Amino acid sequence: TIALSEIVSVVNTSDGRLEVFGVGTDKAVWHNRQMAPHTGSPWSGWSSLKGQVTSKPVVYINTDGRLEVFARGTDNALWHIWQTATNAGWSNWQSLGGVITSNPAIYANTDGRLEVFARGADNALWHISQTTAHSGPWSSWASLNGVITSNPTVHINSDGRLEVFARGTDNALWHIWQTAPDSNLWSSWESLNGIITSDPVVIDTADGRLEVFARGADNALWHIWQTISHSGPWSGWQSLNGVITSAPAVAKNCDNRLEAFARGTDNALWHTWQTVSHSGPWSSWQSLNGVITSAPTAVRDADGRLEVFARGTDNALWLTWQTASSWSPWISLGGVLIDASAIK
Amino acid sequence: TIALSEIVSVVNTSDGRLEVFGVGTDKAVWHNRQMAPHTGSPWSGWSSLKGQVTSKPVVYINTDGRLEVFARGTDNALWHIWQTATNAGWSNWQSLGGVITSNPAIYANTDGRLEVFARGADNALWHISQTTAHSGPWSSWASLNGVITSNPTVHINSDGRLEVFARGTDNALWHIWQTAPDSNLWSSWESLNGIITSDPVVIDTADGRLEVFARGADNALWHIWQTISHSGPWSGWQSLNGVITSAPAVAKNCDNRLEAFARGTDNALWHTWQTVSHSGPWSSWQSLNGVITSAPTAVRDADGRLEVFARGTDNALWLTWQTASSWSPWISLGGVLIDASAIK
Ligand SMILES: OC[C@H]1O[C@@H](O)[C@H](O)[C@@H](O)[C@@H]1O
Ligand SMILES: OC[C@H]1O[C@@H](O)[C@H](O)[C@@H](O)[C@@H]1O
Ligand SMILES: OC[C@H]1O[C@@H](O)[C@H](O)[C@@H](O)[C@@H]1O
Ligand SMILES: OC[C@H]1O[C@@H](O)[C@H](O)[C@@H](O)[C@@H]1O
Ligand SMILES: OC[C@H]1O[C@@H](O)[C@H](O)[C@@H](O)[C@@H]1O
Ligand SMILES: OC[C@H]1O[C@@H](O)[C@H](O)[C@@H](O)[C@@H]1O
Ligand SMILES: OC[C@H]1O[C@@H](O)[C@H](O)[C@@H](O)[C@@H]1O
Ligand SMILES: OC[C@H]1O[C@@H](O)[C@H](O)[C@@H](O)[C@@H]1O
Ligand SMILES: [Cl-]
Ligand SMILES: [Cl-]
Ligand SMILES: [Cl-]
Ligand SMILES: [Cl-]
Ligand SMILES: [Cl-]
Numbered sequence: 001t002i003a004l005s006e007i008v009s010v011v012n013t014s015d016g017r018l019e020v021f022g023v024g025t026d027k028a029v030w031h032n033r034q035m036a037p038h039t040g041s042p043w044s045g046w047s048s049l050k051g052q053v054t055s056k057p058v059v060y061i062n063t064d065g066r067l068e069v070f071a072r073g074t075d076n077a078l079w080h081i082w083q084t085a086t087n088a089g090w091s092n093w094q095s096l097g098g099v100i101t102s103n104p105a106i107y108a109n110t111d112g113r114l115e116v117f118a119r120g121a122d123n124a125l126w127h128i129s130q131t132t133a134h135s136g137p138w139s140s141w142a143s144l145n146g147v148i149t150s151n152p153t154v155h156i157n158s159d160g161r162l163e164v165f166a167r168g169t170d171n172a173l174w175h176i177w178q179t180a181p182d183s184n185l186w187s188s189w190e191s192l193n194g195i196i197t198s199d200p201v202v203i204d205t206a207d208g209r210l211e212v213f214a215r216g217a218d219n220a221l222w223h224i225w226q227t228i229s230h231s232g233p234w235s236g237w238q239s240l241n242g243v244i245t246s247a248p249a250v251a252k253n254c255d256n257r258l259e260a261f262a263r264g265t266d267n268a269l270w271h272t273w274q275t276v277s278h279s280g281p282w283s284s285w286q287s288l289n290g291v292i293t294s295a296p297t298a299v300r301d302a303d304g305r306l307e308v309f310a311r312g313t314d315n316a317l318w319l320t321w322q323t324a325s326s327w328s329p330w331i332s333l334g335g336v337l338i339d340a341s342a343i344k
Numbered sequence: 345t346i347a348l349s350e351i352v353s354v355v356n357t358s359d360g361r362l363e364v365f366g367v368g369t370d371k372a373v374w375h376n377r378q379m380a381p382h383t384g385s386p387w388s389g390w391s392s393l394k395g396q397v398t399s400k401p402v403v404y405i406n407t408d409g410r411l412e413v414f415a416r417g418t419d420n421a422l423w424h425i426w427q428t429a430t431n432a433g434w435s436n437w438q439s440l441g442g443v444i445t446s447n448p449a450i451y452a453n454t455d456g457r458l459e460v461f462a463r464g465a466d467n468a469l470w471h472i473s474q475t476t477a478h479s480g481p482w483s484s485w486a487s488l489n490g491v492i493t494s495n496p497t498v499h500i501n502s503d504g505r506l507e508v509f510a511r512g513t514d515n516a517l518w519h520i521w522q523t524a525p526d527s528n529l530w531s532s533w534e535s536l537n538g539i540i541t542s543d544p545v546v547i548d549t550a551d552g553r554l555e556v557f558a559r560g561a562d563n564a565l566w567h568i569w570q571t572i573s574h575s576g577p578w579s580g581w582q583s584l585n586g587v588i589t590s591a592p593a594v595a596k597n598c599d600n601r602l603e604a605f606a607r608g609t610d611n612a613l614w615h616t617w618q619t620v621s622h623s624g625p626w627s628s629w630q631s632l633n634g635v636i637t638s639a640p641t642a643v644r645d646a647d648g649r650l651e652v653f654a655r656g657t658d659n660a661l662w663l664t665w666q667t668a669s670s671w672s673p674w675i676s677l678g679g680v681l682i683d684a685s686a687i688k
């Protein structure tokens with residue numbers, strides 16, 4: 001098992017609007033979007049992109065600005081749907097085949113080719129890519145091996161190499177990296193040790209270091225980072241303390257200060273942040289209240305403010321954001337969302 | 345003629361450091377870089393990358409994080425030098441041939457291929473590109489036609505199409521765009537009218553609109569913008585007032601508020617900014633003092649603060665940056681910089 005998952009995927013569109021993707025009780029993908037590129041914008045309300053998903057749906061922006069959503073189908077194949085034009089209409093759901101046993105994890109190579117990673121029926125990591133920038137056709141599936149017990153997460157290093165993180169059978173954090181940008185040449189799997197009890201989340205620091213966050217065996221928030229830009233060694237695991245009852249979410253403030261969010265034991269949203277400057281000391285854990293039934297999902301909007309989404313007791317999606325002084329009261333975006341995570 | 349030019353090219357490196365490129369009295373390219381990814385970092389001091397340039401040297405970051413500098417040679421060919429590895433050492437200067445009669449203008453296509461634009465001996469716009477992402481070999485040269493009387497500037501639209509801006513023989517602002525990302529298919533040249541007396545500068549708004557700034561016939565700062573994301577019509581020319589004695593520079597605050605900088609009649613640095621939120625009303629023009637002998641160069645650092653560089657009366661490069669309350673006193677980074685602009 002893993003800590004309670006994020007229930008939505010969110011992106012900041014090519015025109016600076018937040019757009020959020022979730023799953024309804026009938027297993028269709030629904031989306032909600034800001035009308036205007038500003039904190040506290042009115043929302044569309046939930047509309048259906050249809051489909052029948054058995055994973056968290058994961059949105060990623062092509063290098064031409066077209067959103068593309070990836071999800072496991074009821075046949076355990078990887079399916080996707082894409083905007084036919086930037087912030088315009090959507091394709092039908094189409095199958096990329098395979099058999100996957102995790103949520104998909106997506107990143108753009110330096111050459112604009114999306115690459116998708118997912119656990120397979122053999123519990124190894126598999127991958128498939130666009131063959132040219134933001135375009136089909138897609139490559140054949142292949143495996144990067146390993147034995148995976150969490151959803152994987154991919155990021156890009158500051159030198160353009162993709163790097164993937166996942167829990168192993170020993171509950172350690174393991175990773176594998178491209179040896180060159182845009183490559184099908186990968187390293188061996190290596191262990192970053194620790195004991196993690198959530199999916200890992202990964203982000204790039206202002207200074208081009210990958211930093212991974214995960215819940216520990218003691219239900220504290222732990223993190224580990226590249227000690228120098230796009231390079232080993234890693235820092236070794238450090239505790240940010242707290243007692244968390246969901247996966248953590250991480251985002252960057254517009255001054256690049258990292259900020260971590262998670263559900264506490266009182267089922268409120270809690271957060272801790274780098275103080276003063278990026279890579280500065282972490283704050284005490286503080287409450288943003290609410291009563292939430294999912295991990296929080298954190299994103300920086302077009303005004304450079306963090307906005308956090310979480311499911312409420314009513315299964316609606318609720319929203320709170322940074323203000324000059326503190327954070328807004330929670331407001332409901334309605335809907336009825338389920339946790340469709342392929343790994344729980 | 346055009347308003348007094350920016351004398352340096354600056355970028356925020358893949359590891360969050362400012363790195364600035366200028367020209368010395370013996371026509372070599374020199375660079376200065378922050379040691380640390382923070383406002384008020386110590387600087388390297390100026391070191392020579394050698395070469396013999398007859399244009400402003402223009403740095404651009406490859407999609408793999410490697411800096412690449414472009415400049416006209418004494419043979420009027422396009423030359424370049426690149427990092428052999430991200431924030432590591434440099435190649436020798438190598439020729440991409442051609443005959444150019446402007447500073448080069450560079451952008452990355454959505455597919456990671458750098459594309460360089462420059463005026464030719466026929467006064468038309470010419471272009472050359474990497475044939476694969478962040479890699480040689482380079483394409484053949486070809487022309488996009490037009491008749492150009494300023495340095496050109498290129499940007500990317502929020503749908504991935506490159507768009508180039510330049511003054512024409514009628515002193516109007518003209519532009520041309522790719523009809524598809526990564527394409528060799530371009531529009532015809534179209535006039536955005538006006539009368540401009542500086543090089544144009546172009547930036548993308550938080551909400552994915554191109555916005556162009558230029559000095560007008562009345563020596564005020566004027567701007568014009570796409571009315572909707574990656575689309576016409578344009579707004580028509582609007583004055584931001586002021587009386588400026590250099591080209592303007594533009595940068596985005598970390599909340600995406602646009603801020604414009606230019607030399608005033610008192611030879612001090614002046615600025616005007618969007619107030620409250622991105623796309624909000626523009627402020628009064630305010631002084632940041634100094635006595636400057638170049639256009640200012642503005643960049644957002646890894647702490648999300650604007651830093652502005654300008655040549656002083658001593659021909660040293662000086663620097664002032666945003667603080668919580670206002671702006672820092674000017675400090676000198678030394679050196680002896682010339683305006684090597686291929687168009688003056
Ligand atoms: O280029 C438009 C779209 O074409 C489809 O064939 C691909 O499967 C998508 O991944 C791509 O975004
Ligand atoms: O070679 C670069 C790679 O080196 C390894 O030692 C690190 O653990 C990776 O995170 C890094 O991407
Ligand atoms: O530079 C080292 C710093 O890196 C940051 O990314 C971490 O969150 C800090 O905890 C750490 O002290
Ligand atoms: O602005 C600095 C920090 O101050 C705290 O009071 C806010 O709640 C954080 O979300 C923010 O990152
Ligand atoms: O790929 C490394 C470098 O190779 C050279 O051949 C190209 O001319 C450069 O533009 C490129 O950055
Ligand atoms: O077709 C898209 C293009 O349309 C033109 O009308 C606009 O002037 C361009 O700025 C835009 O890139
Ligand atoms: O949305 C319209 C606004 O766009 C901004 O990018 C301009 O700088 C403003 O002057 C304009 O009012
Ligand atoms: O922070 C809002 C604005 O306030 C002014 O006082 C600063 O000098 C500007 O540079 C800044 O964009
Ligand atoms: Cl549904
Ligand atoms: Cl379709
Ligand atoms: Cl469909
Ligand atoms: Cl392996
Ligand atoms: Cl728990």
Ligand SMILES: [Cl-]
Nearest residue numbers: 016301302550
């Ligand atoms: Cl943004």
Ligand SMILES: [Cl-]
Nearest residue numbers: 337338339340
């Ligand atoms: Cl559920």
Ligand SMILES: [Cl-]
Nearest residue numbers: 368370371372
């Ligand atoms: Cl020199």
Ligand SMILES: [Cl-]
Nearest residue numbers: 435436437438
């Ligand atoms: Cl070389």
Ligand SMILES: [Cl-]
Nearest residue numbers: 394395436437
């Ligand atoms: Cl050389």
Ligand SMILES: [Cl-]
Nearest residue numbers: 489490532533
């Ligand atoms: Cl034409």
Ligand SMILES: [Cl-]
Nearest residue numbers: 347588589590
């Ligand atoms: Cl003047």
Ligand SMILES: [Cl-]
Nearest residue numbers: 206360645646
């Ligand atoms: Cl930055």
Ligand SMILES: [Cl-]
Nearest residue numbers: 681682683684
């Ligand atoms: Cl000079």
Ligand code: NA
Nearest residue numbers: 012013014016
């Ligand atoms: Na955006």
Ligand code: NA
Nearest residue numbers: 109110181182
């Ligand atoms: Na890559």
Ligand code: NA
Nearest residue numbers: 106153154155
């Ligand atoms: Na990721």
Ligand code: NA
Nearest residue numbers: 006151199200
């Ligand atoms: Na996740």
Ligand code: NA
Nearest residue numbers: 356357358360
């Ligand atoms: Na950077």
Ligand code: NA
Nearest residue numbers: 453454525526
């Ligand atoms: Na392009």
Ligand code: NA
Nearest residue numbers: 450497498499
């Ligand atoms: Na440009």
